[PDB]
Amino acid sequence: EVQVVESGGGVVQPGRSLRLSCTASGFTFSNFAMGWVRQAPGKGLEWVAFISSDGSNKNYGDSVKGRFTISRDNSKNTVFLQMNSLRVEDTALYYCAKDVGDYKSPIQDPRAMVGAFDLWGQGTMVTVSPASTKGPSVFPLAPSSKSTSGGTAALGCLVKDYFPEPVTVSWNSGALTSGVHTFPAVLQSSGLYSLSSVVTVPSSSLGTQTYICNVNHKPSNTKVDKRVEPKSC
């Protein structure tokens, strides 16, 4: 069967270069255009680069012009993406993809460029950050000052500016699990991650029960316990 496999991804500092490779098998490689497409977590699909069967005709997505170069070696069934002058914003999963091609106006026309990809790889991840390992700063998300009677109240902690992933969070050392949700992280333009954790609790408990979020960041050997209390106003 037709297959495509990327490699070369990793964590790299801004300014530096990285070369991704894609090897194809199971079809006549020289009869099809190939391309690279990327997707950053929480964002959409973005065209990176495209190259004709013979390697002569190339094009690039606007965000990468003059920094990335695509090439292929038809004797080795390989496509390359040379990435220069990397930015935090180039952080993404990078897919190698095969153009669907088309016939001669049934025989295969190697000059075809359809721009529709009928075979994609699983992708290789590229993360761009200037950061060294760094433990988080934890800030409280205090319950509403209007939750003074009954009902329920959301409270949380904002876990900011750590690297690399992951952080895990518990509440009251694991005593509190119902109504707890810890969100996926966001990569900031700084190249550091942030996330939030929230718990919903009875409003009547806010004056009597202590709530502490316990943050664990093993990469930096850091744990933080942050008491989240009602606001004074």
Binding site: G42, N59, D118, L141, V186
Partner: protein
């Protein structure tokens, strides 16, 4: 450069859904439209190309069409494995750059009751402000289908810069949650009368507002 899609479409198992893709004559009008499915931990998959052609192996419950400035993907016989994100795409060869993809649509195969989100908007903590930073945190929970749109306002004006929003994540009760952040300077925070988080879900928008001058 923008192919617009609805953020969410849904139906019960066995029913049919359609997903629209809207653009202009420069893109959709003149060029072929393709459609893709993607699902985390899988390679994306081509469903339709050249407006309405199925590549080998794609069954006929998938269809495509195009008229004027909008194109459409149809999926009949909806089944659980169809829950994924769908993207249209086209390539305008009359410009030097590459192709474009649409804004994306989550298709949900309805398996539980619809649930409207609870929205909680946290102003910057005094602690964070003392650290010379300011993050508004909009936490959105207990909704289904698991797709929302989030927009921010400063006073009455839309804000685009400084916004980050996470993809909805399954909760332990099997509903979904999402988070959105608006990063400001302490000056910006104190400079406005209010800020609002607006969350749109299935025909409802819920807006929460906070103010530097009030105890939320």
């Amino acid at each position: 450069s923008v192919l617009t899609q609805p953020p969410s479409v849904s139906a019960a198992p066995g029913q049919k859904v359609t997903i629209s893709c809207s653009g202009s004559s420069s893109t959709i009008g003149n060029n072929y439209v393709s459609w893709y499915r993607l699902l985390p931990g899988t390679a994306p998959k081509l469903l339709i190309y050249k407006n309405d052609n199925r590549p080998s192996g794609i069954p006929d419950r998938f269809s495509g069409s195009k008229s004027g400035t909008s194109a459409t993907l149809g999926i009949s016989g909806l089944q659980t494995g169809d829950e994924a994100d769908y993207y249209c795409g086209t390539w305008d060869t009359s410009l030097s750059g590459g192709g474009v993809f649409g804004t994306g649509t989550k298709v949900t195969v309805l398996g539980q009751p619809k649930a409207n989100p609870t929205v909680t908007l946290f102003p910057p903590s005094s602690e964070e402000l003392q650290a010379n930073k300011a993050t508004l945190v909009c936490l959105i929970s207990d909704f289904y289908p698991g797709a929302v749109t989030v927009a921010w306002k400063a006073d009455s004006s839309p804000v685009k810069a400084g916004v980050e929003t996470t993809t909805p994540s399954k909760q332990s009760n099997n509903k979904y949650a999402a988070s959105s952040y608006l990063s400001l300077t302490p000056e910006q925070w104190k400079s406005h009368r209010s800020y609002s988080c607006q969350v749109t879900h299935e025909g409802s928008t819920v807006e929460k507002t906070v103010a530097p001058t009030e105890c939320s």
